Structure formats: C-alpha cells, structure tokens
Design a protein around this ligand. Structure first.
Ligand SMILES: *[C@@H]1O[C@H](CO)[C@@H](O[C@@H]2O[C@H](CO)[C@@H](O)[C@H](O)[C@H]2NC(C)=O)[C@H](O)[C@H]1NC(C)=O
Ligand SMILES: *[C@@H]1O[C@H](CO)[C@@H](O[C@@H]2O[C@H](CO)[C@@H](O)[C@H](O)[C@H]2NC(C)=O)[C@H](O)[C@H]1NC(C)=O
Ligand SMILES: *[C@@H]1O[C@H](CO)[C@@H](O[C@@H]2O[C@H](CO)[C@@H](O)[C@H](O)[C@H]2NC(C)=O)[C@H](O)[C@H]1NC(C)=O
Ligand SMILES: *[C@@H]1O[C@H](CO)[C@@H](O[C@@H]2O[C@H](CO)[C@@H](O)[C@H](O)[C@H]2NC(C)=O)[C@H](O)[C@H]1NC(C)=O
Ligand SMILES: *[C@@H]1O[C@H](CO)[C@@H](O[C@@H]2O[C@H](CO)[C@@H](O)[C@H](O)[C@H]2NC(C)=O)[C@H](O)[C@H]1NC(C)=O
Ligand SMILES: *[C@@H]1O[C@H](CO)[C@@H](O)[C@H](O)[C@H]1NC(C)=O
Ligand SMILES: *[C@@H]1O[C@H](CO)[C@@H](O)[C@H](O)[C@H]1NC(C)=O
Ligand SMILES: *[C@@H]1O[C@H](CO)[C@@H](O)[C@H](O)[C@H]1NC(C)=O
Ligand SMILES: *[C@@H]1O[C@H](CO)[C@@H](O)[C@H](O)[C@H]1NC(C)=O
Ligand SMILES: *[C@@H]1O[C@H](CO)[C@@H](O)[C@H](O)[C@H]1NC(C)=O
Ligand SMILES: *[C@@H]1O[C@H](CO)[C@@H](O)[C@H](O)[C@H]1NC(C)=O
Ligand SMILES: *[C@@H]1O[C@H](CO)[C@@H](O)[C@H](O)[C@H]1NC(C)=O
Ligand SMILES: *[C@@H]1O[C@H](CO)[C@@H](O)[C@H](O)[C@H]1NC(C)=O
Ligand SMILES: *[C@@H]1O[C@H](CO)[C@@H](O)[C@H](O)[C@H]1NC(C)=O
Ligand SMILES: *[C@@H]1O[C@H](CO)[C@@H](O)[C@H](O)[C@H]1NC(C)=O
Ligand SMILES: *[C@@H]1O[C@H](CO)[C@@H](O)[C@H](O)[C@H]1NC(C)=O
Ligand SMILES: *[C@@H]1O[C@H](CO)[C@@H](O)[C@H](O)[C@H]1NC(C)=O
Lengths: 211, 384, 420, 148
C-alpha cells in the first residue's frame, strides 16, 4: 500500500541558528508529495532497501515499534548496525550478528553506544561513514493517516561507524501502523521565522512554480 | 588629506581621508571547562596495531589535547597535515577527533593522502578528497618485523572485511619493504559543542565592550551582548547573510550572545583651501562621539567645528541639512543650511503686481562637450 | 493570445467636415520620477579583508584598485546630492502661501502643507511616503537635504505656482488672483479666456474632483509607485548580492577568512587568502560597475525631472505629451522617497459636434479668412469659432481678414460678412 | 571657479591616466612589478607563473580604466547632446522653454568656445520694479462683459 507524504520530512540541515530568512540548501530530503510505502503488522516487518537514505514514521498509541537493523546482508558475514529503544534506554551496536529468523522484541562489536494520538518521525542517512539521525514527535488531529500540514525534524545522533548499508528492517514488540519514504538529493528553500525555526519549505524540483 | 590627494595644495571641500575602527580593548578566550588529558600517548604505544584490511578507529572526545607531545617527537617519519597547520593545533578545536590506527609497508605510505590512488587506497583505506587532518607515521621494523605474516591487506572510510586477501612478509632484514605504524588523525570540525580542545586557558567573559573574542577556536572581534536569539538546544552558532558568525553560545555557560562588529566609519576632513587656512574639522561618519570642540551631527561625530545657531548658504556640505564654512575670530563653523530667504507673496483675490521696468541680465552657462582622446596600445602597456 | 494593439477607429475624415469639441474635461495625471538613490559607500579594505592585517598586507600588492573603488562610490554618492539639488532648488526664495485660501473655488488643501504633521508634508506627499518602503564595511550616508527640506522646497515651488503663475521662475514673484492665472493658462492653450470665467465653478469642481481621485488612486493602488519602489528594490538587491558574495569560497578552503587564519600558518594561508581577495575584489568591482551604470540612469531621470520642474512647474509647456496627456495648464510638484511626483493639470477636449467647414468665405469678390479659429456651419448658417471650444460668432470684418479673390482658393463658400 | 565643470573634466581624465600608469608599479602578487626583473632572474618554466600574475593584474587594471572611460564618455555625450540642443534652440532660435535658456525670459544666446567645452552667454529679460494694482477679470459696460 501507499500514501502521499505531503510536505512532511523537512529537517534542520546544519547545527546553525538562522532567523527571518529564506535559505537555499542542497541535501538528501524526502521529496514533497512523494509516496511513502505503508505497513500494518496485524492478522509486517519485511527487509527494505535503504537507497540513499530513509525517512521513517509511525502513528501510535501503544508503542509497538521499538527498533531498526541496517547493513548489506544482515547475516554475520559483515558488521550490521542494530538500533533498539528499550522502555527508557536507547541501545546501539554494530556486531557481526546472525539475527533472529523473524526479528521482534519480547515484552565483532567494533562500535557500541547507549543513551492513534502520536506521530513520531525519523530520518536516517549515511555520509562518509557517519550515520546521522534526526527526529520529531507530535500530536495528530487526523487519526487515520499522515497530516496534510507542516513540521520539521531536528538532529539527535551521529555514529562514526564507516559500515556499508544498502538494506534495513524494523523491530516490533510482542508477548501496527508505520510508513517509509526515500530521500533524494534536492535543493530545498527553507523559511526560518523570527524564532530560529523552520516554518515552511519549497522542494525546488517539484514543479515549475516551485522552481 | 594632503597624502590622500597626493598634493601639497588642498582645495576647499570635504575629503574622506581614512576609515576609523574602534579597537578591541582586550581578548576573550572561551573553551569548554573540561580537564581530562587526551589519550594520544596510549594510541602511539598500543600493543598491536591493526592490519590495514581491518584498521581500528578510536574516538578521542571529552579531553584537552597538547598536540606538541606528538609534533615535537623525534619518532615520526611523516607528520603531513592537509586542512590545518600542525603549529595551530593547540589553538584550534573540535567536536571529536578520530584516530585511524594501523600498519603498512613503508613504500605504501605514499597512498595515504586525500585524492591519492593505489590498491590500499582503493580497496581498504580511501581518505576523503577534502581530508581535514594529519597523517602521522614511522618505521616500526624493530617493533613489528620477526618473518611476520599477520599484517593483511585486501568510498571514504570504506571498511571491507583466488581472493584479494594477502599479507606482507616482514623480516627485520626487509628499507621501503619494512613495516610502518601509521595513525591518521581526522578532525571533526563539523558543528556541535566542542569536546576536544588544546591546552590554551579560557579568560572570563566580557559584555557591552569591543573585544578580540575566541569561542571554541572561532576567532573574531566585536561587542558581545546578551540576546533574545533563542537557539534550539542542538544549535551552537548563528550565521549572518555573509556566513560570518552573528551570535554564539558560550561553552562554559549556555547563554546566547549577540556579536555586533565594533563601531566604524569614514573620517572625512572638512577644510577651507590651504590657500586660506591650515585649520580643519573632522567628521567621523555614522560614529557616536562617545565612541571616539565636539558636536554630534546626524551624519556623525564632528570635531574642530563650532556649531552656530544661525543658518547660511551651504558652503561645504556635510549631511542631513548640516553644512560648514570658514568665517569670522576666524574658525570653521557648522550650521543647518538656509534654503533661502522666506517670502510671503502678497496674494489676494483682486490684487496684481505688474513690473514697471526690467533688467537685461546676461547669465553664463558652461557645458562639457568633449574630453581628452586617449588611446592605449594594450600590448605595450601590459608587456613593454 | 495574439495581443490587440488597441480599439480600431476609422476617423470620419472628408474634405469639408470638422469636429469641434463643445465641452472639456480638466484632467490631473500623476507622473512619478526617480531623482536619487541611497548614498551607499563601501570600505573596500574592510569588505575584502575585514579586521585582518594578514589579509590587508596582501591587498596592498593589488595597488590602487581599492582607493579608486572608494573614489567611484564617492562620486556616485555626491551626484545624488547634485541631482536632488537640481530638481528641487530651482526656487531662489522660500515662498509661502497667504493665510486665507481664496483661490476662486480651486482647492489645493490636499497638495499644500498640513501644519498638523511632524514634518510639514502635504496629504498627497504622505500617501507617497507611505506607499514606498551590512556591518561588512558597507555604510549608508545621509542625503544633504532632509525630507523636511525637500518638503520646504516643494512647498515653496507650489506656493509660488499658486500665488504668482510662472513669474516666480522668471523674476520676482508677482501676485495674481488664481482665476486670472488660469485665464492666462487658457490663452496659453489657445482657448479664449472668457471660456474660463464663464465656466469657473465647473472648472474648479472638475479640478477639485480630479485632485480627489489622486488620493483614491494612491491609497488603493500601491503599484502606481513602481518606478520609485523598483529603484529601492534594485539597490537593496545589489547590496544583498554584494554581501552574499562574502560567503562564496572562490576556490579557498573556507569563505570565513578567520577559518583560514586560525587553521593555516602564513605560507600555506596566503595561497588561500589570495583566492578570497581575488574573488571579493572582482565582486566589488562588479558592484561598483553596476552602481556607476545605475547612477547614470538615475542622473538621466533627475535631468528629466529638473527639466519638468523648470518647463512644466515654473512654466506652461507647449511640448505635446511632455507634461501629461492633453493640452498642458500647470503642474504641482510633490516630494516622494528618492524621487518627485508631478500632478500635471491638463485640458482635454471632450464632446464633439461634426460640422460642415470651409477654408475661406467669398463675400463680394473678396475671399475672407478667419483671424483665429475656423469657419463652421450648422447646415443653415455660417459662424467663425475658436479651434478648441465650440463658441459660434457671427462672421464679420473684425473676425476675418481679406486676401485676393474667389478664383484662387479651392473649396471657398459664398456667404455674407457683416461689417459692424 | 566659474570654469569648474570644464576643469573637472580635465582633472577626471588626468586622474584616471595617472592611476592607470601608477598601477604598472603594483606587484599583483608577482615577485617584482618590473617585468625585466622576472625575465632577468628566472628561467621560463618558473618565470611564466610570475608574468601571468602581472598580465592578469595589468589587464584587469586596463579593463577597469576602459570601463570608467566608457561610462564617463556617456556622461560627456549626454552633456554634448544638451549643448547641441542649446546651440540649436537657444542660439539659432529663441526659446519658450522656461529656465532652459538661462534664468528670466529668454531673448538670445551667444556661444563662446572653451577648452573641452562651450559657454553660452544667455541674454534674458528679467522684470524688476513692481507696482501693486487692483484688478478685475472682466468689465461691465452696457450689460456686456468686456475682456482684455
Ligand atoms: C556496499 O555493498 C554492496 C553490495 O550489497 C556493494 O555492491 C557491489 O559492488 C561491486 C563493486 O565493488 C559490484 O561489482 C557488485 O555488482 C555490487 N553488488 C550489487 C549486489 O550491487 C557496494 O559496492 C558496497 N559499497 C561500499 C562503499 O562498500
Ligand atoms: C477643500 O477640499 C477638501 C477635500 O479635498 C475639504 O476637506 C474636508 O473638509 C471637511 C470639513 O469641511 C472634513 O470633514 C473632511 O474630513 C475634509 N476631507 C479631507 C480629505 O481633508 C475642504 O473642506 C475643502 N475646503 C474648501 C474651502 O473648499
Ligand atoms: C460639460 O461637461 C460637464 C461634465 O464634465 C457637465 O457638468 C455636469 O453636468 C451634469 C448635468 O448635465 C451635472 O449633474 C454634473 O454634476 C456636472 N458635473 C460637474 C463636474 O459639474 C457640463 O454640464 C457640460 N457643459 C456643457 C455646456 O455641455
Ligand atoms: C443654425 O444657427 C442659427 C442661429 O443659432 C439658427 O437660427 C435661429 O433659429 C431659431 C430657432 O431655433 C430662430 O428663433 C432664430 O430666429 C434663428 N435665427 C436666425 C438668424 O435665423 C438655425 O436654426 C440653426 N440651424 C440648425 C439646422 O441648427
Ligand atoms: C458664389 O456666388 C457667385 C454669384 O454671387 C457665383 O458666380 C456665378 O456662377 C455661375 C455658375 O458658374 C456663373 O454663370 C455666373 O456668371 C457667376 N457670376 C459671377 C458674378 O461670377 C459663384 O459660382 C458662387 N460660388 C460658389 C462656390 O457657390
Ligand atoms: C501514489 O499514491 C496515490 C494515492 O495516494 C496513487 O494514486 C498513485 O498512483 C501513487 N503513485 C505511485 C508512483 O506510487
Ligand atoms: C535496556 O537494555 C540494556 C542492555 O542492552 C540494559 O542494561 C538496560 O537496563 C535496559 N533498560 C531498560 C529500561 O530495560
Ligand atoms: C568475529 O571474528 C572471528 C574471526 O576473527 C569470528 O570467528 C567470529 O564469529 C566473529 N564474531 C561474530 C559475532 O560472528
Ligand atoms: C516566538 O516564540 C515565543 C516562545 O518562545 C512565542 O511566545 C512567540 O509567539 C513566537 N513568535 C511568533 C511570531 O509567534
Ligand atoms: C609512549 O609511552 C612513553 C612512556 O611509556 C611516553 O614517554 C611517550 O611519550 C609515548 N609516545 C608518544 C608518541 O607520546
Ligand atoms: C563551567 O564552570 C562554571 C564555574 O566556573 C560552572 O558554573 C558551569 O556549570 C560549568 N559548565 C559546564 C558546561 O560544565
Ligand atoms: C590664494 O592666496 C593668494 C595670496 O597668497 C591670494 O591673492 C588669492 O586670492 C588666494 N586665492 C583664493 C582662491 O583664496
Ligand atoms: C551615544 O552613545 C551614548 C552611550 O555611550 C548614548 O547614551 C547616546 O544615546 C548615543 N547617542 C546616539 C545619538 O545614539
Ligand atoms: C541657540 O538658541 C536656543 C534658543 O533658540 C538656545 O536655547 C541655545 O542656548 C542657543 N545656543 C547657542 C550656542 O547660541
Ligand atoms: C460624424 O459624421 C459621420 C457621418 O458618417 C459619422 O460616421 C461620425 O460617427 C460622426 N462623428 C461624430 C463625432 O458625431
Ligand atoms: C469634396 O469631394 C467631393 C467628391 O467626394 C467633390 O465633389 C467636392 O467638390 C470636394 N470639395 C472640396 C472642398 O474639395
Ligand atoms: C503690495 O501691497 C501689500 C499690501 O499689504 C504689501 O504687503 C506688499 O508689500 C506690496 N508689494 C509691493 C511690490 O509693493
């Protein structure tokens, strides 16, 4: 299944304050009005391609989705980034795992690290071996699907792992609605208000008016 | 004014002779208040360096780095740096530093650079083409040769664990055939709060005064002030339209400082001709007199001219309705210009004025019509 | 679509037909002109090498580029004051209006000063001032004349124009009653002055209503100021371009010059800094070249505005379509940000009758010709009348002059001529 | 100081040439501004790097001068078209154009030559000694309104 991304998936491109200004930036972004693939883990945890980078989201009330796996082959022949959220902690490893036959959470580790009503949005990308993560949490007024309205994600993490990633998967809690979109290299014109905050954007390649 | 015009005679007028800038009173140094010494003395003494097919990366973080301990050492066969000069490493600072630590054949040290190529740099140690850091290496024949056959070889920072897997045979009798230990320091300037900085001490902070600041190795000069620029918690600096820094967060106390550049302006000199007087007045354009007879015009602080309460024709222009002249008791005066004598025309619905007489005036008007016909032989001008 | 050039009109010409306007409309047409632009100056050394000695010592190797750029911007900055002086300072004395405004029913209260204001602008000058809207070594110098001084000059020019006709331009101002000034201005367009005095209330009401429409036009339609607002926008766009070019790398490791001087030691750094100097200097030469060419366009507009002030405000113009559409009567100047606005007052003829006409009239052998105006017929009778307003008069030896006889002239007509 | 406009056009051109000549003394980042130093001190593969800096600088300096002279020549041409218009309307005619042909009502103008320019002696009638009078737009005779 599919749905329209609308204007979702904008994020602060760098750790720099700017205000009352329209800023042109080129980066991996989710294209405006692209189609996110959609999933329903009832009565749905496949391995996806990673492409250049991933936007990811879920619409929530019970927090079933709790992690991700990334790599080339995910089968102990090479290192593979595991990301887990476990009740309060975040736990991250790159070990040469052979994962479960059907990866879920029960209700050479060269790098390791530690730290519906809700929509939670994430972006993952790899550049020069730096795995970067951005996110946002928000309430939603529409229960059924992604809201046709604007908000932007902020950075949380950067992992200097150097590992090749071309595939990924997501992890579910057992004794669920989630979305995936692919980033592309796009020029975005970003509107910053008085308060350091991105309030609107133009994906310049979308249509001739956006150009 | 004479030196500006390249002349001993100066005509009556106003001349921009120089540009004034308020000088920084003192320097301000603001590094994070962190005190651990960095672990480089461990890295350069590690018991077993990695094979180059499987090179180790150590994250240096949360520490103070005296790079002189490395750079002064007699050990290193090379210390080449590609985005920084090694003399500056104690003054500059970083979010993290990554040490890539491994062993290679001495001939192959040539492959470790930005933009270089060859079988290591292709298969198992590609640097970024914009590599911002230093390659530190030395001959390790006496440490690592035996032969010894353990040292195996096969995008930027690609790790890739018949097939291409092979090892050097390091006997101590091997010179370019010998093992070399190499540590490549890659520096994370890419923005966040700094956590790897040189041993240079922080001063106290100063506000509301012109100072030569340095925050985490961002040097500059300006008037620092508390500000309503409400940074989001991840943001470390704010940038102007010019990409010059416009606000900062102090790394020891997380308040946001506006940076405004120190006051500056053109130094106009107002003069009657040298063929009249040697007295002059100075207009510091746009500058407030508290930042420099003295008189605040709307055009700038004016010095050496008397403000006069009358008004006259504009003899030498200044700006914003102010003009100046040299007048008797002789001195330069500055005054609001008179636009002309005021005249209530004697109008009423049945009065007319008719001239009973005339004057045949003659008024000269002068117009340029041509200018000196130059020609330049561009090859003789350029090449002689 | 293929554009249409205008409505299509076969004019009803024939060898004996003339159309004469039986009535007029006084029209007031606003013309807006740029006169100056913001007096910028850039300290080229602080733009290129801001607060670095290490960069400034390299910039001295480029010789007198920096000083001739500061000279070129200073030449532009001074000629903005010259332009502003030439447009407004055409009046030798600050004339001021009588206390009582007995201008024969004409009502200048919307264009004359209002003493209620903090700067003594008129009502229409306030609309114009409402509808029209950098630490990197950039600076803005003030104009030599404040907007209050420009409002004193537009007040003086206007108070002269109202109380004294053209006379305040040519010599000492002579008072003349405003109805009699307009009567001269009607003779100036070849309309016999009794056409004013017989219609003075109508002409005053047309003028007062036309001034009223200017306030509604300027209040509703901000795009009318487009010439002045574009001069502001072009200068802001040029400065924003000049400033954004500081952020460009030009092939150096970083455009922020303090990065180069903190990261690199002198013999490594000077190679990088010379790229920034070369790029920034070429960018500043580009800005100064654009400003010199733009300043020449503003000077052409200021010379035109000064010419309109001289010929159109201080006088009455015979130059067709120079002083707005229609036959010109008079113009009132109004100040605006970096410009001037003329309210050109003009006579437009408005209600035609077709008539039969003739070049001459045969009386007894003699061919009579009109002294001024044209011979015209309503079909049964022949009248002479002035060219620009239908006013039939009996044909007489006072209205006409003889020359030669009937045999010489093509299309002459027989009629009596009354000899008073 | 009456000749100020003509003396200024002479000064601007002399100032431009003296600037263009003095730029030959500038290094532009070469090891000397005297081209014979480079050619007497260096062999060609070394020298051509230095000479290319002088060529780039001197050529950019000459492009700047020619750009100034093109813009200045347009200013002088606009003044020459104004002077030609004054000759045509003001000398060869009499002008109704208020304040075009000197202050006052224009009678005639005499041209006189000057270095790089022209000077017009505009002869103008200026009215000079008022009397006040009571006035009227029209006069009643026997019922008829008479106008002048
Ligand atoms: C990341 O892994 C993929 C495989 O999942 C690599 O793709 C192969 O690259 C080789 C050349 O090195 C090609 O000959 C193969 O055809 C590719 N295989 C597939 C299935 O596409 C990729 O090169 C790796 N990238 C890095 C930087 O390690
Ligand atoms: C002159 O014309 C103006 C309008 O063009 C008249 O001004 C109005 O005057 C009345 C009071 O008489 C006020 O209530 C209005 O607010 C005024 N309008 C404006 C826009 O100012 C003025 O009355 C006229 N005066 C004469 C003598 O005709
Ligand atoms: C000349 O034209 C004007 C309009 O421009 C005529 O004046 C209008 O006349 C009507 C009645 O016919 C009145 O209701 C309007 O109020 C008048 N307007 C103005 C501005 O006063 C005028 O009557 C015409 N005169 C002739 C002789 O035809
Ligand atoms: C042409 O003009 C004349 C004069 O205005 C008109 O003749 C007068 O007409 C009125 C009636 O409309 C008579 O009372 C007068 O006695 C006539 N005077 C003369 C001198 O004859 C004439 O009617 C007009 N013709 C047309 C076709 O309009
Ligand atoms: C103007 O009137 C005269 C008579 O008053 C006309 O002259 C006569 O014209 C006819 C026809 O050509 C001749 O037969 C007569 O001999 C003419 N008489 C005289 C005294 O010349 C004349 O034709 C009329 N012209 C117009 C334009 O109507
Ligand atoms: C995108 O989704 C819309 C419905 O949201 C659908 O009509 C369209 O065919 C989809 N296109 C692609 C390329 O998935
Ligand atoms: C999360 O997992 C780690 C081990 O991976 C464990 O130490 C930690 O206590 C866990 N936290 C919670 C709240 O379960
Ligand atoms: C780590 O590498 C060794 C060989 O060096 C291998 O035997 C082991 O299986 C690897 N670890 C994992 C978790 O597979
Ligand atoms: C900016 O943020 C503050 C709270 O940080 C808020 O009160 C204010 O309304 C915001 N500005 C605008 C234009 O809403
Ligand atoms: C290696 O360790 C010794 C002490 O065991 C120390 O003196 C030396 O400085 C270290 N090497 C480096 C390069 O710092
Ligand atoms: C740094 O030191 C000051 C006292 O000198 C202390 O108040 C402040 O909390 C410290 N900041 C950090 C980031 O540790
Ligand atoms: C210059 O000085 C001389 C006397 O040295 C004097 O005669 C002359 O009038 C002066 N000129 C001006 C313009 O002041
Ligand atoms: C000039 O600076 C002083 C403080 O030094 C301030 O009180 C004054 O208001 C300033 N004047 C202007 C015109 O800004
Ligand atoms: C100027 O005049 C004002 C009153 O108009 C007076 O207060 C002030 O002291 C005078 N200043 C001088 C220097 O004469
Ligand atoms: C004048 O008369 C002609 C007769 O054909 C007519 O076409 C034309 O429209 C008329 N014009 C006016 C202004 O009455
Ligand atoms: C006007 O033209 C007609 C034919 O169209 C001709 O009969 C008549 O004589 C001409 N009249 C004049 C005055 O030319
Ligand atoms: C004309 O008469 C008035 C009477 O008040 C007087 O003010 C004015 O000065 C007189 N003007 C001349 C030129 O005599």
């Amino acid at each position: 299944a599919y749905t329209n991304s609308f204007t979702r998936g904008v994020y602060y491109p760098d750790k720099v304050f700017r205000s009352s200004v329209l800023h042109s930036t080129q980066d991996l972004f989710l294209p405006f009005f692209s189609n996110v693939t959609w999933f329903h883990a009832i009565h749905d945890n496949p391995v996806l391609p990673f492409n250049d980078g991933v936007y990811f989201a879920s619409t929530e009330k019970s927090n079933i989705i709790r992690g991700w796996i990334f790599g080339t082959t995910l089968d102990s022949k090479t290192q593979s980034l595991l990301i887990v959220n476990n009740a309060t902690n975040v736990v991250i490893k790159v070990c040469e795992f052979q994962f479960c036959n059907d990866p879920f959470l029960g209700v050479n580790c060269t790098f390791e690290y530690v730290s519906f009503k809700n929509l939670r949005e994430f972006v993952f990308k790899n550049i020069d071996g730096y795995f970067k993560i951005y996110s946002k949490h928000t309430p939603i007024n529409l229960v059924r699907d992604l809201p046709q309205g604007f908000s932007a994600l902020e950075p949380l993490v950067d992992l200097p792992i150097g590992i090749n990633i071309t595939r990924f998967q997501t992890l579910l809690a057992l004794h669920a609605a989630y979305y995936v979109g692919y980033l592309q290299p796009r020029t975005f014109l970003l509107k910053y208000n008085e308060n350091g905050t991105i309030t609107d954007a133009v994906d310049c390649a979308l249509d001739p008016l956006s150009e | 004014t004479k030196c500006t015009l390249k002349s001993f005679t100066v005509e009556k007028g106003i001349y921009q002779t120089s540009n004034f800038r308020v000088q920084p009173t003192e320097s301000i140094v603001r590094f994070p208040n962190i005190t651990n010494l960095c672990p480089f003395g461990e890295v350069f003494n590690a018991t077993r360096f990695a094979s180059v097919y499987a090179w180790n990366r150590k994250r240096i973080s949360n520490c103070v780095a005296d790079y002189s301990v490395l750079y002064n050492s007699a050990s290193f066969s090379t210390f080449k740096c590609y985005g920084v000069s090694p003399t500056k490493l104690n003054d500059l600072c970083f979010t993290n530093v990554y040490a890539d630590s491994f062993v290679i054949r001495g001939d192959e040290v040539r492959q470790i650079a930005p933009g270089q190529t060859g079988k290591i740099a292709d298969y198992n140690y590609k640097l970024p083409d914009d590599f911002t850091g230093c390659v530190i290496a030395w001959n390790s024949n006496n440490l690592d040769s035996k032969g010894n056959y353990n040292y195996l070889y096969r995008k930027p920072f690609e790790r890739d664990i018949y097939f291409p897997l092979q090892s050097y045979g390091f006997q101590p009798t091997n010179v370019g055939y010998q093992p070399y230990r190499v540590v490549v320091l890659s520096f994370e300037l890419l923005h966040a709060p700094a956590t790897v900085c040189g041993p240079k001490k922080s001063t106290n902070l100063v506000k509301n005064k012109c100072v030569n600041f340095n925050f985490n190795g961002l040097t500059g000069t300006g008037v620092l002030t508390e500000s309503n620029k409400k940074f989001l918690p991840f943001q470390q600096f704010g940038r102007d339209i010019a990409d010059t820094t416009d606000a900062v967060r102090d790394p020891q106390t997380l308040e946001i400082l506006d940076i405004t550049p120190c006051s500056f302006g053109g130094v106009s000199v107002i003069t009657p001709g040298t063929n009249t007087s040697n007295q002059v007045a100075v207009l510091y354009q746009g500058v407030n007199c508290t930042e420099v007879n003295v008189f605040q015009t709307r055009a700038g602080c004016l010095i050496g001219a008397e403000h006069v309460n009358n008004s006259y024709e504009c003899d030498i222009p200044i700006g914003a309705g102010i003009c100046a002249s040299y007048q008797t008791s002789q001195s330069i005066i500055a005054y609001t210009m008179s636009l002309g004598a005021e005249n209530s025309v004697a109008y009423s619905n049945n009065s007319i004025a008719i001239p009973t007489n005339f004057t045949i005036s003659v008024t000269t008007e002068i117009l340029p019509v041509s200018m000196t016909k130059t020609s330049v032989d561009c090859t003789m001008y350029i090449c002689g | 679509y293929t554009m249409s050039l205008g409505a299509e009109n076969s004019v009803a010409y024939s060898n004996n037909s003339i159309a004469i306007p039986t009535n007029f409309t006084i029209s007031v047409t606003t013309e807006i002109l740029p006169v100056s632009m913001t007096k910028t100056s850039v300290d080229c050394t602080m733009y290129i090498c801001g607060d670095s000695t290490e960069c400034s010592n390299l910039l001295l190797q480029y010789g007198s580029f920096c000083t001739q750029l500061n000279r070129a911007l200073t030449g532009i900055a001074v000629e903005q004051d010259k332009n502003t002086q030439e447009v407004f300072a055409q009046v030798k004395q600050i004339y001021k209006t009588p206390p009582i405004k007995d201008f024969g029913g004409f009502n200048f209260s919307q264009i004359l000063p209002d003493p209620s204001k903090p700067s003594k602008r008129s009502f229409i000058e306030d609309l114009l001032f409402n509808k029209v809207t950098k630490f990197n070594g950039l600076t803005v110098l003030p104009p030599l004349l404040t907007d209050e001084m420009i409002a004193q000059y537009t007040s003086a020019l206007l108070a002269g124009t109202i109380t004294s006709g053209w006379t305040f331009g040519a010599g000492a101002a002579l008072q003349i009653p405003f109805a009699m000034q307009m009567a001269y201005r009607f003779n100036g367009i070849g309309v016999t002055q009794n056409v004013l005095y017989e219609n003075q209330k109508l002409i005053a009401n047309q003028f007062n209503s036309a001034i009223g429409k200017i306030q509604d036009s300027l209040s509703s339609t901000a795009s009318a100021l487009g010439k002045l607002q574009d001069v502001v926008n072009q200068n802001a766009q040029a400065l924003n371009t000049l400033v954004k070019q500081l952020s460009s790398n030009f092939g150096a490791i970083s455009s922020v010059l303090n990065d180069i001087l903190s990261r690199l030691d002198k013999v490594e750094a000077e190679v990088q800094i010379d790229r920034l100097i070369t790029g920034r200097l070429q960018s500043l030469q580009t800005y100064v070249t654009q400003q010199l060419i733009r300043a020449a366009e503003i000077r052409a507009s200021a010379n035109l505005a000064a010419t309109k002030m001289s010929e159109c405000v201080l006088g009455q113009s015979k130059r067709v379509d120079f002083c707005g559409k229609g036959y010109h009567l008079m113009s009132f100047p109004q100040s605006a940000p970096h410009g001037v606005v003329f309210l050109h007052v003009t006579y437009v003829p408005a209600q035609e009758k077709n008539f039969t006409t003739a070049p001459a009239i045969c009386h007894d052998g003699k061919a009579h010709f009109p002294r001024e105006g044209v011979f015209v017929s309503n079909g049964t009778h022949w009248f002479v009348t002035q060219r620009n307003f239908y006013e039939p008069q009996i044909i007489t030896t006072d209205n006409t002059f003889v020359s030669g006889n009937c045999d010489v002239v093509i299309g002459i007509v027989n009629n009596t001529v009354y000899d008073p």
